[PDB]
Design a protein around this nucleic acid. Structure first.
Ligand code: ZN
Ligand code: ZN
Ligand code: ZN
Ligand code: ZN
Lengths: 795, 795
DNA sequence: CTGTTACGGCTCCATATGGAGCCGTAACAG
DNA sequence: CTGTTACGGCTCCATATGGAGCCGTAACAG
């Protein structure tokens, strides 16, 4: 009844031995990068998934690929595990909230059994051709590529760049598209250089919609080849639609070309017109699915029926009521049962998955969670804890990677990693009951819980300088035409209930408009009337969890900007001058200094007969990514490889005599990155490391006092000490002369902010108007505000 | 703690309600096709797999596809489930028994830790390039296509059909291959019609191995297109190898072209020569892995080492000993740890998977088994039962679909379906303890267990007619050069221990030689000297579980041969003669009578935008697969659709007045097919239905007394009544004048056979010689024979 | 010296025809 | 009448080039 793990050597784990009780609420806490996330995800979930897959069918195993076996000696008492995290799934327009939560089938059964006609369960489904809309094929949206978007200027000629779509540009004469267009124009007696405005409608229709089955002969010309062939032109729009039907970035780029409109026939009901005639209680399936969760639950609880109907559909009603109660208890009460699954956030998706899992009721399954208390306001923390306890009580086990102090008191076993991070961390410090870790002086978390060290409340708060940004006519999504006023040069925090519209109001309006008006970004903004005060800003920077580099040719050393100084000081040594070298030779991205065999990568491709290609360290240069000639030059007893393999603390200690490098190294050390190596590849960097690198790069560059920063949930997967460092770095950034706007639900970040904007008072269509604004004390004095009440309670 | 299933409507289930206890040994028994297999596999395992998949990652779910949701109201208390059956997995040559059983990693760890050099775990692995053989790339077998096989006769010219490979024939002048060959010949100054024997060696080398990077210009000619292009010829062998590297039938066909030989460098060790130098106890890794399981266990138990080594590798030794004990206890003790996983039978693969699962030790997982007692001799039934009990005891649940009487006594809960099969069956009859079902007179299984009805022992046994088949120099696989003598015209049964070589000796020798010498089959036989008595046989027929038709255009009605008579009698009616029709019009595979809209299929393709195409019954002809014009003709108040939708019993009752149809219908009814419909598609037919159809077709055709039948495990998934009917049908076939040879481990089939041949006395290389032969009483009198001892005990 | 801007070079990711088995039909022999 | 054999017709399965983001370098201004 114990999960005993002996000999774990993944990432930075120093051969730890841990025993975790089963069928109990167990949480794991540690610093950012200390190794808790690796020890959980890469070891336990990976081992469980691989063990379950190896026993499945051969074709299923091949489809799922070969999962990497973790470097662990032996693990016993392991059950199949499923991991729930914040990973949005755009998927397909077919999937909605109703089908994901597994309630649409029950609604179909109820409508078929009881719903009187104005009658089969298969008829009501939009996933089958039996009862789908003939026009939209069940999608409910007539999505087509906008003819005006592909050719924004019809007056401009085709050769001038009329087409603005990838894979269809006619600028290059060597492309097959240009030859096809020329052949079509020759067949239709037209010239390519003729402006589209002067082009006949028939020619434009043929170009944009194919030849309607007509076949023509087009000759092809190559470098040394020639000939003739006969085929049919499919059309630009037809080819684009086929490619879209046949990845995420490419799908998003293609969807940007097209526009989504409601289907004119069924008005986006995804069902046949005859099927909508069936009604129960005066409402059909579409009206029921278009209401919120709370209203739907109230309607179902207040439904009137005879004894025979209740006896016929007792179990259906019980199951629907239980599922709706679980959905309203997990923390969601504003969602609509018809909203597409694509338009959701990470927290909402994770909560929906948790609700589906608890409603389904699986037994003997290990559950892995990744910070479930993020993206949600503090008013639903009790509901989330109750739902998690209910999930645990049925006979499962929970491994919640949570950092909130409230979650610790509700846990039965706490495993704390540390003491530091990276090389310093990776060992188990203390474990046991919450009281034991509270009384344990060897852990930072226990000291924080006991109140030994906490975040103090600032005494002096800055005031706006008089330059205030104004928003007029904000109506994006579920905004009820409200006007807000954000000050400048002051740390600004925006709070509100989950799904109140603050995230949309920020991301889809403010950042997009600022980018379009300042950085010249071709992004369509949201619905707004006008923005006042745009002249007071010069640069806009957005910080997210996306990796800083998609290629292994980048590293934090070159991203921060210290690599140029390192190369200059290496080339300025006596040996380099004697050899007549250059500052560009000490790099692993140009020819001359990097290893020629491995092309400055350190890994060579070793292809196997029946195995995917496996990369091994290069043996020509021992994986140092530098030839032996360059390593002959040494500065202060160290070579370039030693510097690149040297940690940040050692770099700070060694480079104290060079102020122009020490300035950036101090920023890198203070931002929180005290364990990474300068030579670490950017691909393996996690979200926290990327955010820290971006913050350090932003802080390093001098500030002119006219910059604004837009963030989103900056405390995602950060320990309390990490929050205490981040608030200090944000205060330093504000004091530098810039303005920072963040969206954080953490009370610690809010209690220290110099300006609070509240959106509510309820989620969904119920809210959308400003409740209170101003100083934190003023918001606390407000009675009708959850955020104000919590601010008053904490202070 | 209960698995409650309410409202199951899959296949032929009549809305059954079943409750199954958890964490207990539960078996399900029913007649062939009664619905037990459907109720288990299509409902419980499918629901568990879909439930687990829906909670996994989106990409994993897409890779695994969308599993069909079973037609069940609601199921509660379901754990993730894994299904183990007899499905061969050829996979790749990389996978062997050692890596499947998960013992090669432990062997590598032991060798790295203790094995003294003549030292890293990654070095000993053949799945990584670090310590793989440079020549064979870790395969251990240099498999190449035989140059002589593609051109068996070099004297014959290329135009005469020199190439015998699909996709490379030059008979068609319009093929691109012929044009490429002609261009190469023109470049090399040679003629295609020239014989290969007269072809220069350089030309043949270029043709069979490409141009070694040379580029030439080849001109293409089309129906109305022409031109020139430049490319490089890759070569016939290179293209074949690339296609083989890039399915099962195609892979087998390609492997037939090639031959497997040991690697000359490492002698098929799959490891580098330096790696083989490390030895422990005087043996290296290859010698240890080349020994049998029992010898390896004895060697490991008798290994001598100091206290320090034992302390260092205590857990490794314990795990290896436990895994070897489990492997020797499940029922396998003759396998070699280096044999490829491809060369295994279904029962051996299932037992290996069960051993791996019990060794791994998963908790809270539903286990589904498909007749685990088949393919195994009765002497290991106790070992299999003990292994299953050990698997159940650790905290899992078992759902074993077993028919053996011995397995019933070891079960704790029995769910019996019936009472008949097909439409008659599909309902739960009785359930409970063994005593309750034994005392229940409403179940056939209880009556059989109580001894109310049993299989009697025949009193008179036939004798050979003097024409005896002789086998000389049998040396295939693990045969120790023994000679056997099989009589003719007498029911012959071959028994032996599991993996004694009887299956190989039959399939790879007797059937292949008979097919080659009689039916002109181009199949390479096994290693044999000569076969005597081949002149006494005329036809050879093999019966297996393979489906009889891969297309929905076939059905048992047309496979048996009664459809021609049905069409003739339909066309002979007065209305057909008046209309001037023909006997070919009443068919669903020719033009004129079948529905033109659906092309006589009854289903139309409805393509969706973002969903795989879903087939829906045709509405033009209501899915009757016949136009309204043909249905106007009625015979005896019934139309052709009614006849095709009429069951076998009703057809027998109705068609009693036509002897030429009644003769085949009586055979179909007596073979055991009393529930299927004549119009049922052949694709949905299972193994038992296909075997019954084949047996009925064979029995229907008149016998000249010069035919031999070869079978294999005919009692796979057959109830006791099914066995009692099959033995009667086999005795009828023998009395008809033919000879039947079967390989059955069931004691009931053996005790009634008129001739018994025993192979043993042990599995693997230990056995291979005939132990006893002759009458069953003579075999029983033999003391040193497990089969003889069991025959004496039962009699 | 220090910051900004423009350009060159680089890598990673994205987008129809032949063979085998079966059914129906005609001819031939008993 | 009944079995065998040959052939025609049918269906299912199988086999390289352009764009986006980043690093390095030169020129210009303060
Ligand atoms: Zn529609
Ligand atoms: Zn190298
Ligand atoms: Zn080799
Ligand atoms: Zn039809």
């Amino acid at each position: 009844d114990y999960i005993v793990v002996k000999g774990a050597r993944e990432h930075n784990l120093k051969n730890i031995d841990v025993k975790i009780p089963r069928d109990k609420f167990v949480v794991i806490t540690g610093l950012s990068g200390s190794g808790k996330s690796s020890l959980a995800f890469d070891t336990i979930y990976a081992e469980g998934q691989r063990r379950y897959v190896e026993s499945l069918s051969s074709y299923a195993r091949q489809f799922l690929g070969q999962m990497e076996k973790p470097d662990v000696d032996y693990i016993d008492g392991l059950s199949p595990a499923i991991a729930i995290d914040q990973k949005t799934t755009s998927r397909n327009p077919r999937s909605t909230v109703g089908t994901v939560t597994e309630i649409y089938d029950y609604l179909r059964l109820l409508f078929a059994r009881i719903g009187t006609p104005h009658i089969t369960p298969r008829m009501f489904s939009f996933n089958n051709p039996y009862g789908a809309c003939p026009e939209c094929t069940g999608l409910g949206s007539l999505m087509r590529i906008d003819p005006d978007l592909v050719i924004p200027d019809k007056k401009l000629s085709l050769a001038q760049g009329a087409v603005r779509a990838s894979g269809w540009n006619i600028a290059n004469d060597e492309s097959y598209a240009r030859m096809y267009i020329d052949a079509l124009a020759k067949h239709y007696n037209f010239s390519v250089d003729t402006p589209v405005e002067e082009l006949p409608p028939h020619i434009l229709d043929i170009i944009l919609y194919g030849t309607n089955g007509e076949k023509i002969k087009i000759e092809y010309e190559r470098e040394n080849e020639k000939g003739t062939f006969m085929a049919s032109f499919p059309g630009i729009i037809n080819s684009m639609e086929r490619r879209y039907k046949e990845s995420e970035v490419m799908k998003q780029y293609y969807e940007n070309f097209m526009s989504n409109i409601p289907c004119p026939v069924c008005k986006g009901a995804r069902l046949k017109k005859e099927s909508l005639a069936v009604t129960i209680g005066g409402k059909n399936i579409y009206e029921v699915c278009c209401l919120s969760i709370g209203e739907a639950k109230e309607f179902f609880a207040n439904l009137n029926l005879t004894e025979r109907q209740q006896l016929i559909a007792r179990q259906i009603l019980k199951e629907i009521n239980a599922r709706l109660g679980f959905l309203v208890d997990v923390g969601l009460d504003y969602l609509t049962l018809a909203r597409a699954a694509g338009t959701l956030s990470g927290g909402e998706a994770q909560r929906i998955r948790l609700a589906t899992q608890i409603g389904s009721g699986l037994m003997g399954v290990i559950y892995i969670l990744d910070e479930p208390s993020i993206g949600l306001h503090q008013r639903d923390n009790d509901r989330l804890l109750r739902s998690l306890k209910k999930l645990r009580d049925l006979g499962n086990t929970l491994l919640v990677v949570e950092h909130d102090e409230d979650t610790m008191y509700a846990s039965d076993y706490i495993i704390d990693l540390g003491p530091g991070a990276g090389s310093h961390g990776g060992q188990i410090v203390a474990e046991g009951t919450v009281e034991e870790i509270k009384q344990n002086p060897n852990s930072v978390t226990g000291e924080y819980l006991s109140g030994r060290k906490k975040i103090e409340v600032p005494k002096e708060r800055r005031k706006p300088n008089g330059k205030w940004l104004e928003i007029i006519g904000a109506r994006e999504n579920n905004l009820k035409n409200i006007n807000v006023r954000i000050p400048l040069g002051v740390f600004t925090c925006i709070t509100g209930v989950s799904g109140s519209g603050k995230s949309s109001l920020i991301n889809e309006i403010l950042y997009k408009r600022l980018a379009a008006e300042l950085n010249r970004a071709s992004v369509k903004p949201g619905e707004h009337d006008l923005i006042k005060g745009i002249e007071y800003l010069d640069k806009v920077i957005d910080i997210d969890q996306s990796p800083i580099g998609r290629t292994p040719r980048s590293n934090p050393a070159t991203y921060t900007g210290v690599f140029d100084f390192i190369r200059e000081i290496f080339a300025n040594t006596t040996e380099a001058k004697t050899r007549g070298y250059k500052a560009g030779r000490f790099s692993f991205n140009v020819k001359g200094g990097r290893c020629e065999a491995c092309a400055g990568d350190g890994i060579n491709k070793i292809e196997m007969h029946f195995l995917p290609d496996i990369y091994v360290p290069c043996e020509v240069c021992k994986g140092k990514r530098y030839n032996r000639e360059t390593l002959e030059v040494r500065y202060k007893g160290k070579n370039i490889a030693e510097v690149l393999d040297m940690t940040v603390e050692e770099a700070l200690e060694f480079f104290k005599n060079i102020p122009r490098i020490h300035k950036k190294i101090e920023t890198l050390y203070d931002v929180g990155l005290g364990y990474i190596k300068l030579g670490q590849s950017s691909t393996t960097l996690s979200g926290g490391e990327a955010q820290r690198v971006k913050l350090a790069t932003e802080l390093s560059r001098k500030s002119t006092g006219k910059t604004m920063y837009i963030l989103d949930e900056p405390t995602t997967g950060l320990h309390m000490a990490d929050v205490h460092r981040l608030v200090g770095i944000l205060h330093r950034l504000v004091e530098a002369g810039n303005s920072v706007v963040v969206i954080e639900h953490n009370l610690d970040v809010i209690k220290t902010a110099d300006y609070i904007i509240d959106l509510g008072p309820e989620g969904g269509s119920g809210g959308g108007l400003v409740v209170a604004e101003g100083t934190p004390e003023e918001v606390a004095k407000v009675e009708n505000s959850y955020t104000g009440q919590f601010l008053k309670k904490v202070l």
